[PDB]
Amino acid sequence: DPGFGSLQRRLLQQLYGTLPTDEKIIFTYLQDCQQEIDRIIKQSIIQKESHSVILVGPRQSYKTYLLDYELSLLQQSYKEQFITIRLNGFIHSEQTAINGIATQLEQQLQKIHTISSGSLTEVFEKILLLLDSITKITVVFIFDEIDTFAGPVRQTLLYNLFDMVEHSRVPVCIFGCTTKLNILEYLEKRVKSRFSQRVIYMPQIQNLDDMVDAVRNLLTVRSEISPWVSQWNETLEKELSDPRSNLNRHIRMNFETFRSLPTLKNSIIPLVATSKNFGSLCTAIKSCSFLDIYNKNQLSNNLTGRLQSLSDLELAILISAARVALRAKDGSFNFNLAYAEYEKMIKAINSRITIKLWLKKDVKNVWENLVQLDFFTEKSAVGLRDNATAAFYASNYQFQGTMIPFDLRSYQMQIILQELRRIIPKSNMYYSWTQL
Amino acid sequence: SKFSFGQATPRTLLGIIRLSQALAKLRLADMVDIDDVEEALRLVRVSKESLYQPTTKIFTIIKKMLQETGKNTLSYENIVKTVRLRGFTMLQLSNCIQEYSYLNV
Amino acid sequence: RFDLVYLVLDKVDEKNDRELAKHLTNLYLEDKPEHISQDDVLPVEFLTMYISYAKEHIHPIITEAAKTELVRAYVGMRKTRQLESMIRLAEAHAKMKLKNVVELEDVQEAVRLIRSAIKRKLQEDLSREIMNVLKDQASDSMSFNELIKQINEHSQDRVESSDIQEALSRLQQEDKVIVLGEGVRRS
Amino acid sequence: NVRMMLRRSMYKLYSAADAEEHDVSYDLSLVENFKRLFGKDLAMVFNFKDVDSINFNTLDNFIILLKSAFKYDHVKISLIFNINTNLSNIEKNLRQSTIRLLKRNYHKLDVSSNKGF
Amino acid sequence: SRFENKLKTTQKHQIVETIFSKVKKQLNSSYYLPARENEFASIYLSAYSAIESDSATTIYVAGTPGVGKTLTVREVVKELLSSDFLYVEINGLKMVKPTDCYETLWNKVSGERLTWAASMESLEFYFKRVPKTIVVLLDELDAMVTKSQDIMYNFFNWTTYENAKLIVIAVANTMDLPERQLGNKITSRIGFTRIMFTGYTHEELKNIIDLRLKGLNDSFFYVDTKTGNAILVRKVRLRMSADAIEIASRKVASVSGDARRALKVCKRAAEIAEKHYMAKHGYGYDGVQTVHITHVMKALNETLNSHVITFMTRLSFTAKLFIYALLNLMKKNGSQEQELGDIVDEIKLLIEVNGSNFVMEIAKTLFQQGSDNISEQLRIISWDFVLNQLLDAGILFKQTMKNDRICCVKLNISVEEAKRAMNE
Amino acid sequence: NVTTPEVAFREYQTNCLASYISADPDITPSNLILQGYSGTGKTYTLKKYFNANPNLHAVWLEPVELVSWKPLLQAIARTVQYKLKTLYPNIPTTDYDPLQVEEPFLLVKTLHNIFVQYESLQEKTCLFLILDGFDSLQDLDAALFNKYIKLNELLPKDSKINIKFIYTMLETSFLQRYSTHCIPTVMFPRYNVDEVSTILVMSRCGELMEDSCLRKRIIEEQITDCTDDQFQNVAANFIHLIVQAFHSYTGNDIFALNDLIDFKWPKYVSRITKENIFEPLALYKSAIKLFLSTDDNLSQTYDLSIISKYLLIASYICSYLEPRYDASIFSRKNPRYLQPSLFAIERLLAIFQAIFPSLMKANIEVFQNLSELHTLKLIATTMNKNIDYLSPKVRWKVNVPWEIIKEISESVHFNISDYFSD
Ligand SMILES: Nc1ncnc2c1ncn2[C@@H]1O[C@H](COP(=O)(O)OP(=O)(O)OP(O)(O)=S)[C@@H](O)[C@H]1O
Ligand SMILES: Nc1ncnc2c1ncn2[C@@H]1O[C@H](COP(=O)(O)OP(=O)(O)OP(O)(O)=S)[C@@H](O)[C@H]1O
Ligand SMILES: Nc1ncnc2c1ncn2[C@@H]1O[C@H](COP(=O)(O)OP(=O)(O)OP(O)(O)=S)[C@@H](O)[C@H]1O
């Protein structure tokens, strides 16, 4: 029936929160935090307040979800009353963000009813004179990752907007969102004195019962769409009320390691779309065996399934590669030291008994995949630079490790020898070589 | 360290309770007030001190005391003299000294 | 050879000793503890009768079914007195709760018991230095003084000459190093 | 690097392309649109002058970039490896996954001023 | 200028002017000064002489931010319009590149847009040729000093010309600035006026508050009981307890002596009573009132108190499992910086050193999410996740290496409070 | 609701990609991770979905044929207006310059310019962008991958056309840097020995029965009318044996099997008979010689002259001979495995004058063959390759392994193994 599929239409967009803004559902463990945000934001526009704030909390904590929820909550009734300018610290550098502001300004003017033209500092004094200066348009600033603007060197752009609090007749409000906790020490003196010092910490799921209360409000549909709905609602809580039920059991695991709702929210999306009839879906949340397969696939090739998916030789090279690595003090080992001890390992197997010992010219083809399976690392290799110009400074630098040949790049170890004994089963013949 | 001796035991807490009971017995009262424990702790601390040889109102009182000489003294004999006639014990003001030191006054 | 040791250390902190002082003054709240009966607590006369009946009426056997969990409980302390103590511990677990046959879950807690009942820089540097001044002494003795001297000689980790005296005492008494004379120090 | 080895080389053919033709970006964008940018098709050749001085992982990462151009069918690629000597040294330095890419139609022509006098 | 005509809109639907709304209007940081009263003259009498005599001087003031040096010199020039000059606010931090201030000066003499190269040629051509008047504020001088001092030499070499119609006013962060960044050749040109600005004192911090509270302290509002709207049905009054204003002063003068910090802590404490008043009656947004001492007690503490302690006890289990392992290595080795593989080595070991107890229901879950099918994980579940979560939180810090074993980890908060918050 | 395809070994993974992708934008999650190593057919199984779904619209980008992010933005903006021309040709357009963009602001500046003229559409249509190979971009860093995550939210959310992403990358150490963003991931496992052979047989039957190298060998031998099934069997007998005699050498690859087949196939074809078409086991016994050798290597006696040969044989001596021992043991009166030490100049001629057969004094040609050996990259500089001539601080070192030294010792009749003594 399409009515079961219509219930899939409702349940999915409930799991993404893409409902119309009247029915977007905020969990109970943060309802206080949005209201004090609301008391900040709605008196900034209506009562023309000119005060700033910094949102602070970890990643995936509904922070950008909270703010545009207020805007949509105010877009229904205060349409022309305000404009929003949203800046990411990621997408904007220090200097193009000036062009980021001015270009996003002028497109609001056609929506509310010569600015970007000029040099970068020409348009900069323009928006200075247009901001510092029936009712006045108020402007809401949305800043994502404001900590990256808070670098050591210049900090110009923070200094201008915070002085716009002090002098401008245009009512503004600033919204810093970040995750660096002690944001206030990152600022210097002259900017912090411009700052109105009010930060608000974002809550976490402090009790096991909280997210249990959240997922109940998450999955339950309240509006009547499908005939299945009344049947579907009582199946949900019956799994949730029982502490010995598997869905209630597996939510406890998510409380333990992650303690973060959108991780668990991610898991349910395939679980409710993989069903094809109504009764299969109810058994799925009754069994929750799909969550096992899901946590299998999320785990299947980080490190262990990397190891399980290799042939007999690739194990035997790496097993020898750690027995060399245990000997030296730093643990580094060359390719010649690997193949030498690999030779006597195979010779020990025949003398205690028929195994094809390979050559030199072929192990390189196996050695190529092992370094790009990250079971080894180069000895002094900074992997990923943080930003662009630090990576560009590493590209021009001609290297010395390529100038020594392939068989002498001093490769070090990612997975230590003692941990191999716990994963390699005793049925394999090389199990005597895991231990020394 | 160098001038230290022993540690806090539950028998000393029981002895403090017994000394407070003895102080209440000497006042012939059926109950133990706040005045006995602050005397017993002062007794057990001054027993070892010879080797070296409810707050806002108190803060207001301190300000009143200041409105004369403007002195930030560390230990008191004539600040506490205007407190006992009011109704608060010696222990409440003792916390008011330490707390407030966070006001840097 | 001791069957059971007990670390009964306090390690004083908050939200623990406060309940300790509250429970010690809760019977000082009333002059007589007549209100001790409304809690989950067996009386002494019922307890000794149950204990005397269980000690003379139950002869539990330790079956082979609890073999597998015992081997692995032994190797964790090995990675025979402990095995002889834990089999008497497991049969006492079987002695309680009116059981004639021992069960697999009963040794789990027993081991948790002996794992919860028991739950270097200093001397290392010490010996290190001792070795040093030995070497630099042409192996002659390190002095109390020079010892203390080089050992406070580093600001980092503050080796107090008393602490020094103590650990020194330890190693010597541990027989690792020999020190003689009240007024002198020997490496 | 990988980067300027691409960027100068695309520049060097592009001026050679306009001079026979009678604004654009200097990367592989021109390679597919060369049928439309210049009409006739393309057969480029790569005179790698001194091949053993180059860091071979740059060369190995270079040839994988050329491997992506094999799906347009109006372009033909040809590589000339002017080694100084020591062919056995060269099969040691590269990645073995790319030697199997190299070994389709190889030709070991000798060019020496002193060849049997 | 232009677009302020377009920044106006029409429909303003009767915003509720409550009791504490009219406070924050004057508690805005905009609108003679009590604290720097005589030093205003010391600037002005230094400035009045050169202005009415057509000379070229230099005036150097310093001090911590929040002392009025942004404010006072604006009050100098403001009265001077009543009695020949071109006022420019050459801010240091409002220049994108340091050379961009050169463009402004040549713009602010005739109206031309020329090179920072081509500006300073004609600027130099101005400053030694014109027969005979320019006031310039060189604000926040930490910005324009950084590269090679070639800019800063220009701004005082123009002062040396006797035919230069210019009056410069430098305002810095520190008095030390021409002694620890500039050369002595600039330090000869800076002069030795050096007007020092101290902090504010707590008596004057009372005397700065009531200047904003001039016509509104203990005054009366006209209020309808239905909407909470106040007008300068009851006729209510609102009083400000001056002792709480005093304890605001005795802290801010103690730590910083900052005039923004004094106003804003009063501004933060004002809105605490705003929401509690709205909590008890609910007038929304469409007998005698006061502000207690208990408001400024919280809001001043609200500048101080943290949450990383409360953040840590509200984290995940494996987060608190991680830090407890990390302090165990720091008291094992005493090296405060442990290798990442040794931590993974420890959290394995910290399972089985505890007994066969809850720990097993942990140890089941700690290596597989149930699901006895898929098991035998080496490192723990979500070990990349919590280590990423501890990284972007700022609690931890991990140096960059492609090896995921010998990359070092360093703590970033005090390890004792990490030890202390672990106890809960 | 969607029309899923069906493939060989992605029965779980086809479901999730049918789950995490719908034509409706609201059900569609924003960002997505398809992760797995090379050798899983992710570019196969993604396009194989898309051919079965003509209802959606896919724009295919290829980062590996680009080199940097600055063209990668130019790669995106050129293609969406290229695609939306071919989806809604009635809509008029102020076509913008995709060459103009070079900075991450300029994309969302231009996508603000692109999508606004397309506002008059009838329903919220999604538009899937596909990036293939995000880890092997050759200028990547930490702060590029997050830079492309938040691009959706800088767009106006209420536009009729919504751009969403799918990221293809590898090297799962890289994904562990960004698990805290918790974007939905679908990992792709590696393969097992049977399903390698099972994939390989249903993908290589279409060429190896239709190659002319078979078709020549059909008419060259006395052709019995063997069936295509008889051609299918010998093809299947080939594949089921070639993965059996080589799996330990190659791992669980597919690309490294796809070419080793195409090297050993015509050499297998020549060793068949008319009769061994019915006789597969003895056919392997006759074609045995290729199944135990790799044949991927397409040992030189080196070209260099005699005085240059002794110039090499003295340079290998300071891989173990320290200055504390050498002047005693080489009077005119083991690190064979280890990495070589560092030379200086004239220590060569110190050893070179000793070990040469007073018989030589002129050193002009000896100085000739040094920078001859420098161009051969057999002895290279420690520092940059510029100032090494004038004797500043410059250290030298060999780059030749022991065996090529050992042959070149006997090639000039010189004995070297005596002077290497552990
Ligand atoms: N357009 C959207 N509508 C509704 N919810 C959204 C939308 N985009 C993201 N979310 C939700 O946002 C949550 C993630 O938290 P965010 O605040 O977006 O990220 P954050 O880490 O908390 O802050 P950011 O985004 O990293 S700066 C998830 O629950 C998403 O479902
Ligand atoms: N004496 C005063 N009388 C009245 N208002 C004052 C007084 N001092 C400061 N203010 C106000 O407090 C604000 C503080 O700004 P200032 O102290 O002028 O700037 P500042 O001291 O230069 O700090 P900066 O600009 O970051 S170096 C002023 O803008 C006024 O609004
Ligand atoms: N289920 C399958 N059925 C048929 N062929 C398959 C299947 N899975 C993989 N393949 C084949 O495997 C080949 C590998 O293609 P790729 O997608 O390039 O591999 P890869 O793992 O994606 O490496 P890349 O290209 O670097 S991402 C495809 O060309 C298919 O022919």
Q: Which residues of E touch F180 (CB under 8 A)?
A: 385, 388-389, 392
Residues 6+ apart with CB under 8 A from D59: D51, D94
Of A205, A206, A257, the CB nearest to E318: A257
Closest listed residue to residue A8, CA positions, set F125, F22, F1, F13: F1
Rounded distance, CA F243 to CA F194, Å?
Answer: 9
**CATH 1.20.1560.10 is right for the domain spanning F11-187:** no
Rounded distance, CA F138 to CA A395, Å?
Answer: 9
Closest ligand 1 atom number to CA of residue A64? 17
User: Rounded to the nearest 5°, which phi and psi values hold at F368?
Assistant: -70, -45
Query: What subunits touch chain C, counting only 3 or more CB pairs under 8 A?
Result: B, E
C21 touches chain B (CB under 8 A): yes
Helices A363-371 and A312-325 cross at an angle (nearest 10°) of 70
How many angstroms separate the CA of residue C145 from the nearest CA in chain B?
20
Indicate which residue's Cα is closest to atom 27 of ligand 3.
Answer: F38
Q: Pairing mode, if any, of strands A138-144 and A172-173?
A: parallel
Residue A143 is inside which H or E element, if any? strand A138-144
Q: Which residues of F touch E402 (CB under 8 A)?
A: 173
E172 alpha carbon, closest ligand: 2
Residue E43 near ligand 2, beta carbon < 6 Å: no
Amino acid type, A180: K
A178 alpha carbon, closest ligand: 1
Residue A296 near ligand 2, beta carbon < 6 Å: no
Determine whether the interchain pair F65/D69 forms a contact, defined as Cβ–Cβ distance below 8 Å: yes
- Sheet of E230-231, strand order: E230-231, E220-223, E234-237
Exposed, middle or buried by CB within 10 Å (0-12, 13-18, 19+), for A426?
exposed
Mutate which of A18, A65, A71, A142 for ligand 1? The one with the most ligand atoms within 8 Å of its CB, which is A65
Residues 6+ apart with CB under 8 A from F386: none
Residues 6+ apart with CB under 8 A from E419: E327
Residue E186 is inside which H or E element, if any? helix E184-189
Contact A208, A34 (CB under 8 A): no
Rounded distance, CA D113 to CA F303, Å?
Answer: 12
Q: CB-side exposure of E214: number of CA atoms within 13 Å? A: 6
CB-CB neighbours of C16 under 10 Å: 11
Q: Which residues of C touch B10 (CB under 8 A)?
A: 20, 24
Determine whether the interchain pair D68/F376 forms a contact, defined as Cβ–Cβ distance below 8 Å: no
Q: Does the annotation list F4 as a binding residue?
A: no
Closest listed residue to residue A312, CA positions, set A371, A360, A358: A358
Distance of alpha carbon E258 from its chain centroid, rounded? 11
Two tokens, residue A317: 């090279």
What percent of the residues of chain E are helix, what percent strand, and what percent coil, each to the nearest 5?
45, 10, 45
Q: How many residues does chain C have?
A: 187
CB-CB neighbours of F188 under 10 Å: 21
Helices A2-16 and A261-273 cross at an angle (nearest 10°) of 160
Rounded distance, CA A14 to CA F26, Å?
Answer: 10
Of E334, E352, E424, the CB nearest to C76: E352
Q: Which residue has the tokens 């207690």?
A: E292
Ligand 1 site residues (CB inside 6 A) read: A 16-18, 59-65, 144, 177, 262; F 157
Residue E33 near ligand 2, beta carbon < 6 Å: yes
Closest ligand 3 atom number to CA of residue F168? 27
E16 touches chain A (CB under 8 A): yes
Rounded distance, CA C96 to CA F15, Å?
Answer: 55
Contact A189, A66 (CB under 8 A): no
CB-CB neighbours of F359 under 10 Å: 6
E267 alpha carbon, closest ligand: 2
Rounded distance, CA F398 to CA F376, Å?
Answer: 11
Q: Which residues of E touch A135 (CB under 8 A)?
A: 8-12
Q: Which residues of B touch E250 (CB under 8 A)?
A: 103-105
Determine whether the interchain pair E355/C114 forms a contact, defined as Cβ–Cβ distance below 8 Å: yes
Q: How many residues does chain E have?
A: 424
E305 touches chain A (CB under 8 A): no
Taking CA A155 as the corner, what is the angle to CA A152 and CA A156, rounded to the nearest 5 degrees? 155
| Longest distance between any two alpha carbons in chain E, whole Å | 96
Q: Does the annotation list F36 as a binding residue?
A: yes
Q: Pairing mode, if any, of strands E230-231 and E337-339?
A: unpaired
How many angstroms separate the CA of residue C8 from the nearest CA in chain B?
15
Determine whether the interchain pair E355/C13 forms a contact, defined as Cβ–Cβ distance below 8 Å: no
Residue B87: which region, alpha, beta or left (left: phi > 0; alpha: psi -120 to 50)?
left
Q: Pairing mode, if any, of strands A199-201 and A53-56?
A: parallel
Ligand 3 site residues (CB inside 6 A) read: F 7-10, 38-45, 199, 203, 254
Sign of CA dihedral A164, A170, A173, A176: negative
Rounded distance, CA C117 to CA C110, Å?
Answer: 11
Determine whether the interchain pair A390/F141 forms a contact, defined as Cβ–Cβ distance below 8 Å: yes
- The per-residue b/e assignment along E4-27, b for 16 or more CB within 10 angstroms, e otherwise, is eeebebeeeeebbbbbbbbbbeeb
Q: In A57-117, where does DSSP find H-type helix?
A: 63-75, 96-112
How many angstroms separate the CA of residue F206 from the nearest CA in chain A?
28
Closest listed residue to residue A154, CA positions, set E376, F357, F224, E93: E93
CB-CB neighbours of A105 under 10 Å: 20
Torsion over CA of C75, C79, C80 and C84, rounded to 10 degrees? -50
Q: Which residue has the tokens 């966070």?
A: B102
E250 touches chain B (CB under 8 A): yes
| Longest distance between any two alpha carbons in chain B, whole Å | 46
Two tokens, residue F375: 């161009």
Contact E62, E172 (CB under 8 A): yes
A90 touches chain F (CB under 8 A): yes
Q: Report helix, strand or coil for A377.
A: strand
Q: Find the A26 Cα to ligand 1 centroid distance in Å.
A: 13
Q: Which residues of E touch F176 (CB under 8 A)?
A: 384, 388
How many angstroms separate the CA of residue D108 from the nearest CA in chain F?
9
Contact A319, A431 (CB under 8 A): no
Closest listed residue to residue F34, CA positions, set F11, F50, F52, F16: F16
Rounded distance, CA A219 to CA A11, Å?
Answer: 7
Q: Does the annotation list E285 as a binding residue?
A: yes
Resolution of the solved structure (Å): 8.1
Residue E35 near ligand 2, beta carbon < 6 Å: yes
Interface of A with E in 361-420 (CB under 8 A): 377-378, 381-386, 412-416, 419
Residues 6+ apart with CB under 8 A from E346: E325, E328, E329
Residue F391: which region, alpha, beta or left (left: phi > 0; alpha: psi -120 to 50)?
beta
Q: Which residues in chain C have their C atom more than 2.5 Å from the N of the next written residue, marking a break after them?
A: 79, 119
**Technique behind this structure?**
cryo-EM
Q: Which residue has the tokens 């245009």?
A: A170
Indicate which residue's Cα is closest to atom 9 of ligand 3.
Answer: F41
CB-CB neighbours of A418 under 10 Å: 14
Contact E254, B104 (CB under 8 A): yes
